[PDB]
Symmetry: C2
Subunit: 180 residues, 2 copies
């Protein structure tokens, strides 16, 4: 856990050109399952690197678990190829990153009460209801979760640059609220 945000998860979507028989994908695929009472999609997993694909009846596919935009796109391509080798007429259309989650560690403790009451129109802190402080940044559009320990989670990014920009914005605020 470094000071510069490390990507923890990238979620992407792609549209397959055709409707897929989910039960049959689960039957033929070596590492895919379909239990519609547990989850309304085929769950298919690749081991290296570790990702998961959620394959919906509509032909939409969600790819999750990747640690970068590049790794997300490569994973999506691999799942498409797996589905094509199973005999379905899918195409790879409209790949799009939907969310990027990241974290960092400033290595000092934060007095969350001080931060919350100094910036009450941008954040919420209610430890009875949730742990840590929720900061809604507007420029860029990022939601930060700020913890007493100095761990920071940044959510909602669509491109990496917004993650870094958001952290550059918040850092001088965090330093103002350091505690022992």
């Amino acid at each position: 856990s470094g000071i510069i945000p490390t990507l923890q998860n990238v979620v992407a979507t792609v549209n397959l050109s055709c409707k897929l028989d989910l039960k049959n994908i689960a039957l033929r695929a070596r590492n895919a399952e379909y239990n519609p009472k547990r989850f309304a999609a085929v769950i298919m997993r690749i081991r290296e690197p570790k990702t998961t694909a959620l394959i919906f009846a509509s032909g939409k596919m969600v790819i999750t678990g990747a640690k970068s935009e590049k790794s997300s796109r490569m994973a999506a391509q691999r799942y498409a190829k797996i589905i094509h080798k199973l005999g379905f007429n899918a195409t790879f259309d409209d790949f799009k990153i939907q969310n990027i989650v990241s974290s960092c560690d400033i290595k000092f403790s934060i007095r969350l009460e001080g931060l919350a009451y100094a910036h009450s129109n941008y954040c919420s802190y209610e430890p009875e209801l949730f742990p840590g402080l929720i900061y809604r940044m507007v420029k860029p559009k990022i939601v930060l979760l700020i913890f007493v320990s100095g761990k920071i989670v940044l959510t909602g990014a669509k491109v990496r640059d917004d993650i870094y920009q958001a952290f550059n914005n918040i850092y001088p605020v965090l330093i103002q609220h350091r505690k022992a």
Copy 2:
């Protein structure tokens, strides 16, 4: 905990017209303390209803703990009156609600994974990092925290109406992911 959002906390600010001696407020006030190494403001509390005021050297005051907009304003007025009775020349200027937090309970469990992967551009779910699902609503501007238990917390509202509208918006999504 009802289905309609109940306000849990209202945070407001007001500007006092004058700089205040924080040590002296803490000395003279029956229920106020000042420990600058612990918190950089006077902390003053009134018992009924329970609220807390944070009084800053700049003359800015934050009022917290109120359960409605009306109770927030009445509390702010009471703190101002307390400060005025202590001998400071403060005025009550620019009262403003900054945040309203609320909660409700839909009384069924939610498959958070289903909601997250159906709406991944609006929400984040990473239980290794945080509990429950964080949903950033745009219209109105509200952040919702959605828990497996069916408890919902709505944050970031400036007026009550936005809380209700945000919950009206999310409810049909939650019902789609019941477990």
